[PDB]
Amino acid sequence: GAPATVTEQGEDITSKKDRGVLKIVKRVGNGEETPMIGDKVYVHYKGKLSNGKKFDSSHDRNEPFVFSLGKGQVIKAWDIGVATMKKGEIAHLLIKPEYAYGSAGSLPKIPSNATLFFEIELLDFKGE
Ligand SMILES: COc1cc2cc(c1OC)OCC[C@@H](C)n1cc(nn1)CCCOC(=O)[C@@H]1CCCCN1C(=O)[C@H]2C1CCCCC1
Numbered sequence: 790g791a792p793a794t795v796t797e798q799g800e801d802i803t804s805k806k807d808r809g810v811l812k813i814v815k816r817v818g819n820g821e822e823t824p825m826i827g828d829k830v831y832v833h834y835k836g837k838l839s840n841g842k843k844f845d846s847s848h849d850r851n852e853p854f855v856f857s858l859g860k861g862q863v864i865k866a867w868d869i870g871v872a873t874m875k876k877g878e879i880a881h882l883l884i885k886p887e888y889a890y891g892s893a894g895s896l897p898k899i900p901s902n903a904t905l906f907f908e909i910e911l912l913d914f915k916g917e
Pocket residue numbers: 834836837838843844845850854862863864867895898899905
């Protein structure tokens with residue numbers, strides 16, 4: 790399903806073109822602006838290890854997930870991927886460990902060398 794679809798069909802949005810972050814737009818957003826470093830960004834997300842174990846979602850907290858883009862508050866892949874999204878867009882990202890939690894991982898939630906999958910909906914973003 791979704792992770793394999795991104796493997797097969799996703800755009801490589803990395804500067805190095807190492808397939809570290811692959812993206813499919815699932816629902817098109819509105820407007821010309823995309824988030825820039827420093828912006829406060831508001832999202833809903835569903836995430837999981839690509840091996841389907843551990844499913845984490847903002848809905849569990851009954852509240853949007855808010856972060857500042859580029860401020861080291863989220864994994865590199867989010868900084869890269871959310872900067873490509875329009876307001877209202879829903880996208881799927883598939884992420885190699887070098888753009889997430891690497892060889893160390895982040896136990897107990899994230900093992901070493903983990904590939905991650907997210908669905909992200911961009912709700913809003915505001916300038917610092
Ligand atoms: C490695 O630790 C975790 C990883 C992830 C979630 C974690 C977490 O423990 C802190 O808590 C979820 C609760 C929520 C309100 N929240 C989100 C963050 N901190 N608290 C942000 C923490 C860092 O997360 C990220 O950079 C990414 C993108 C933003 C959304 C959360 N992310 C995760 O890596 C998830 C992880 C997704 C894959 C399945 C397991 C959880």
